[model samples]
Target: SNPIVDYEFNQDQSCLIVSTPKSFDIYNVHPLKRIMSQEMPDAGTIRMLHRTNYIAFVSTKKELLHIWDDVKKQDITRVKLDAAVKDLFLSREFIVVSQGDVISIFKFGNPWNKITEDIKFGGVCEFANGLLVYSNEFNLGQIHVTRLQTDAEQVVGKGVLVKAHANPVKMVRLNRKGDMVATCSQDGTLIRVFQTDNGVLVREFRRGLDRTSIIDMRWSPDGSKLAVVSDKWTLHVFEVFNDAENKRHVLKDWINIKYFQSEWSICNFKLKVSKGSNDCKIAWISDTGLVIVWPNRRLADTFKLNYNDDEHVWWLQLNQRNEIP
Candidate 1:
């Protein structure tokens, strides 16, 4: 039987919890053994808190954010937000909520009080290295960056406002170092990279083969590369580079694209690429009970199938064409 959702980890990484309708399982990264398995409540969006000690999940109904302590096997807290939270982010000490035009920030430990009230802006929002950046169509595809610690939420450091993308910005991500920012647009023909500190336009990587809108974007842990996932179920990886003037913010190298030809595909893929500290790994749930994992930036080594069923699948691949490595 197909597992509901699967998680693949590198030799150094393992799954904390794998839940299925009948049971849930936890695996050890090193020894490759199951730590524990138990029945769990219906799950929604799962996010690892800062310490990895706890995992926060939004209920399917969107009424609550459920925090679970992986070690204690108990529910720590369930925080309520202003509305059904479509997206949630955990900063070092804050939780950013995105519903629509309103973006709210709440203390991680203290969810009752909002540190920043509903800040309205267009497009989506992302937080990294103490900076909060968002974009809108009206600003000529510009990204407004703000320092979270500022006395007043004001733009800082030459806050970049450029016409980087043709269509509305669909997804934005900051590298682990906060030195660079990458944005993908509703029109998936291009991916724009920028220098975060001064908002300088660095380089634009064009995906010639795929014409799908990019839904999700991620940076490698070391901030040396990026991965863009399009609605067409194609995954593109770009290596980071420095320009001729010794400017250290550019993207080079085109990695392989992984396209699976299964009846069930991935609707939405969420990936966390590894860095220097760890081996490169990408994990995401597929429409079927497939939790695909890969190692060392090689998409061909992907491990598929996870526990559980009935979960809403995101996207999938359905072609028999020769794969590109």
Candidate 2:
């Protein structure tokens, strides 16, 4: 078995692409089946063009981007960068790359857009439905949301800056509609939900009080709840809005206690992971279930949330084993 290095979900969140040292594999999220696999040398980070035959990959030893066509089984294109790539986002219309000094945008047609910043420590960027959101070194606490014209002939548009946190922002996850964003800072204690248009704080949740780093954050396909994993070995499920489980009592509201004012998670479970592992990934399986993967161990576990009408609660572990239907 090969050790997993990096992984990502496709734009629709229906498929998961995992990259290893010498190859990359694709799997269907719903049924948890391996659909395709290919051999590539030093495949560090990988992204797909929707569910098409086109694939883009980066090498661990080189500072270049390789675009491969799996259907044709040949190289389509390659883009060389100034330094090593920090992150990559691919959509049907364009591709976004975050590097040492700039966040570049490559459209299918013309007028390549390069947004420059001091991103020596790497950056985070995501593109969906022509909407681009990113954070860099200079404005560590700010999130830039831009709506680029989908037409290849047109140019990029202006972006709105949102003051997300006082310290550096670590994770920025956009919903399916691209209208809302969930963000966390370097502190990794508070997760804030904001609007992309006006930068309004819609809702907030405390991940925890202790100092920890967020491992991964993802929104459900319906954009209702968010699944988050942290280095604390905890998996938390938060309601974006008030639900049956996210109820606030009059006593807790009237008192307005120290930690009671802030919204807390509706349900959570402790994850069993390998020691000394820093990175783990999570992807929502439709709305009722999710899949968590330990890349370093090359192992994955699927869980389903079962609703007990009698108790009015959600159960993370439905059965004795961590397997779903």
Candidate 3:
């Protein structure tokens, strides 16, 4: 089901939650039922940090952060950021908060409190396992990854810093295995996938000339395919292939050129362009539900051709405005 904001699955994959105004609904995976509905004082964005049983929501009205205990089923604590939270992350033991220019880290699993004075962050991700990867907002967009073994933390080992994308990092995601990370810009035109071990850029993908920037991206459950969506209502499916066949433990040089291939066959859908600037969120519901929802006729017509035929016949009447009955 769709909500005003976003929804995410827990680490265990046993439950998920829908972020909505007034309250958020938690669902059980097996029976698929709404198990709990927790109320929030204000409307804001909800993000599930990694796969932990903890969830965090940033209120839109008040500059506050609300943390929920999925195991205990209640609002355990709240922290006042004083500034609007632009993004947030909940690690195994820390809550990474991003306002405009400042990024703050907080200790979780105990009384919630801020730690590691608000550091400048370009992008942040509390990835699976207990890894926290972040980039600096200042000169040289560099990424740093640290292990959160406990609530009290320090930079582990030598944090690998890579000169990330030329633009400000819009979104960053780690593959299901946590070995590779993908970052996108606000324009969505450029996407970079990085190999975490040595901090080498594997491969970069770009959208078509007429296409707008990529808005968001998602990796398949198995980490084989990446779904790249754009504001132009197009979905690009790229398949990941590892170079080293035997060593599955580490992902090195997992570049998109050799390690990944675009599945043109599966991405053969005509996108319905909406009148507005935003594209509807895309989801691969089962194998066939590559559906696109738009506001007007132009966007709707664009999708019809791809829906009806793929052979590219010149004389084919592919419009579905009328019915045979």
Candidate 4:
């Protein structure tokens, strides 16, 4: 089967970048419409930069971290590492990499140089405009926002505290401002959203009763909501912090069962059980209310719902051998 090894969507959600053994391609959604594609010279994972057309990945031979400009069809930048790189994260102007026990962050301009101190390691580190949150090997359940001033040569730490989780952190995503963070753990029972500035426990929602790695978690553009996907074809939308002055928001109080059943979310959706599934993706249609969810490899039936604000939710899943529904 021709499978996608890795993929990432651009910050604006205008285009999706996907990679296969044959070539890396850019699509309107990496499937629905083919906007552009480039045949592979060598195989590797592809990571798209935020709000830009640039993409980066590690080579198959594990010698180089290559950044290519799909818009320009040329190498924008490439960095060589001593040991094989484990992970790479690109924020506004910084690139964070993990090599074994050591984690490093580099400035994303010409002449990429290591700026931060050798951080301990972890699987997830999200970098945004103002805040940076990361976990480490020693403390897999602990997350810290390492605020290092990049104006000078020497990186100075501003001393952010540890935000602990019950198990190894599976994913940690930051919003546009980086003032807030959404975290899911290895135990995977609950997902937590909190204020990074003061480490306030904003809210926690039950994911499942037992441990299971969630597919992914994302914060809405304006930081008002969070969407989480699980293997069971369930999409849970949680209310994050929002200014009630201008929004007709669903109150952020999923405190009890009565409240959960009494009020509906702005865009709450779930796939009616049809087949066993394991993949889910979240995308914003307008960064307002509409979102689209599709299975990674299955051809499913489409379900739509019309709302008061012209919001129509979309869902795709496998339809048992496709007799053509």
Candidate 5:
């Protein structure tokens, strides 16, 4: 049996956490170095707080949540929840837990707030800088966003509903600032970006005509570019629009066609696809470089985004790769 169970990159993509049936390991991405390893069997899900030694963990068989300290080699605090934990999110200031219909928020080990929806909405969610975005069960394509913090108010209010796609949402991503949101439906052909607070349609990007699933979408360090990875074994880079500029790449149509309004990726390249590869994830290693991980193989591939002055286009160039232990 495989020892690995789950793995994820932190908010900034500088660090990675890999969970196994027996233990969890943290890795530094840039130099590709192993940082720490903790043995805790039954640890089902593990999320780290940025690059800190603080880790949030939940077991596979219980509702107990543990806030662990790697330096001290023990848990700092533990909370007993009533329902099974579905997902866990950790930031410098907050820890969020999802259990079926209830979502609980904690600030520095203290209960801060809770949100309960009519239907289970924890399957897909992301939290950043006091902003929480989660999918709604009423419509798989719809999403709800809420600002969890105010200047003086201490309570978190209801979410603003946004109709994101016509079909089920396959992936959702929030930029580092949490002011923008990107989502692609199950059709997996198009990616849409929207304003997080106002729910305004910002930009629409098309992957291709072929029906392929999106494996991962990551925002560049400055939020001016987006890198998308798909099951087609391709990495597509799209130029994000500034607040005031709209590039005229597509011709204006009198019929107001949807496909004509969308913009295509600026550059793209293929990844090493294996026959047994069923899972892949990506994170920005730098402003112009990224690292792709194959959990099934415990392999990592690093690529540098190269600029061509003559062609005025960008492309991914393989830098280095390594196999994880």
Candidate 6:
């Protein structure tokens, strides 16, 4: 009740999960009505499975992970590692566990298929069904998107490297398609979008005139826009679209267009200074729009809510898709 260390919305939106120094609790709709709660003594972190009854949490001291079957309220599996577990991501077909030095990739809920990198960025590394996108710590300020591996190296497709920013990249996000990626740097000056296949730079939007250090950025469901946020009080949303849908096929491919040559979507919210970190997202506002933000260390806090987000040659449709025609 004083403050929460972390929080998450359960798969069906029927419950909410939260962590405090005292315990980890799950609520039905709000905190006033709690359903299931556990006091995981010394549990460092916890993750709720998207659609399954399973829940995962990291060990408070040991480098181990505990996966629980909430339906039966028992242990399903435990994964031990050289480093402590920091982040967990689940796709329909994959399991990605983030650690300090290397990331562990698992398949069909089995063995560790491939060992990856990003020793430290909390949520910078992401993976799903197609490709696992991450910031390369040794590639000299380059972002890489590699196909999800199955076994030895799990290196299925040719790797895509993008030298998008000069400073060490602090955050990386993949679109729902996995072919497009958006990145920001430690300086957090500019946010850029690129193609993971051929390393094509698609769109670049100026976040601010100063060095604000983008705190977070989110891609809309269709990969059409990006929403951005920073340490400052205001939030920005950018819209992405294509006027030449007929020539570019029904799907407007940003790689086929010269988006970098043009300026696209551009654009805050407020809260208690110490509310906390949540997956507070920004969305594009156009029939297309985009949002990007600076990554912060705080977790589970209050915030001012806003909406709708990115891609390139893909001109922003602005507030006219419905009002224009």
How many steric clashes between backbone atoms does each model show? Answer: 17, 0, 4, 1, 0, 48
TM-score of 1: 0.62
lDDT of 2 by residue, 1-325 (tens): 5777778878887788988777888988666778888888888788877798888888787877878888789777777778767788887667788776667777542343443333232276767777878875577888788887764443556778788899899888888888889999889999999888887887899999897889999888778788888888888888784443234344443344433443777778898766756787777776888888666655567777767889866768722223211
Q: What's every prediction's RMSD, in angstroms? A: 12.2, 4.9, 7.4, 5.5, 4.1, 7.8
lDDT of 1 by residue, 89-151 (tens): 665566667765677776667443566557666757777667778875366366687666634
Candidate 1 segments whose C-alpha is farther than 4 A from its true place: 1-38, 137-140, 150-162, 231-233, 242-325
Local accuracy of candidate 6 as per-residue lDDT tens digits, 1-325: 3345555544333455666667777654322256667766556667676646777777676777776777777666777767766567665565677787667765536553444443333345766445777667675467667776555553444677677677788777777667677878887777888877787986777776778766567665556656666777455555544435313565445476534443434443333233454334343322333322111332222222233432422222222111000
Output the lDDT of residue 280, model 2: 71
Best model number under lDDT: 5
Model 3 misplaced stretches (Cα beyond 4 Å)? 1-16, 27-36, 49-54, 70-73, 123-128, 140-142, 149-157, 242-268, 273-325
Best TM-score among the predictions, by candidate number: 5
C-alpha displacement of 277 in model 6, angstroms? 7.6
- lDDT for predicted candidate 6 compared with the true structure: 0.57
TM-score, prediction 4: 0.77
Candidate 3, residues 1-325, lDDT tens digits: the string is 2334545555544455556666776655333456777766565777765456677887677777778778887678878875766666666666777777777777776667765567676544445556667766573346776555462345333467777767666667777667778777656666777887776886666655552666556565566555667766556665454324424656556565544554232353345443653644333332222223232221111122122357732121223321100
Q: Give the least accurate 10-residue stretch of model 6, judged by summed lDDT.
A: 316-325
Off by over 4 Å in 4: 30-32, 51-53, 242-277, 288-325
Model 5 C-alpha lDDT per residue in residues 1-325, reported as the tens digit of each score? 4567888888889988988887899999878999888788788777888877788888776778888888878988887777877777887666788777767776664453333322357367777778888888678788888887643354466669888898888878889888888888878899999998788898889999988888999898778778898888899988885323333355445356533532888888877787988788889888788899988888899988888889877777888879886
User: Could you give me the TM-score of model 3 versus the true structure?
Assistant: 0.69
The lDDT of each candidate is 0.53, 0.76, 0.57, 0.63, 0.80, 0.57
TM-score of each: 0.62, 0.85, 0.69, 0.77, 0.87, 0.70
Better of 5 and 6 by lDDT: 5
- Could you give candidate 4's per-residue lDDT for residues 1-325 as a string of tens digits? 5566566666655566667777777666423457777887554656777647678877765578887777778777778766766666676577777766667778778678777677775766776664667786677887877565768655647656565686788888777667778888877778887778887776677766666778877676677667777655566666554456126566566456534321223344565644544555565444443334333443323222233435543233332221110
Model 5 misplacement above 4 A: 82-84, 111-122, 150-154, 242-262
Quantify how close model 5 is to the true structure by its C-alpha RMSD in Å.
Answer: 4.1
User: What 10-residue stretch in candidate 4 is worst by lDDT?
Assistant: 316-325
TM-score of 5: 0.87
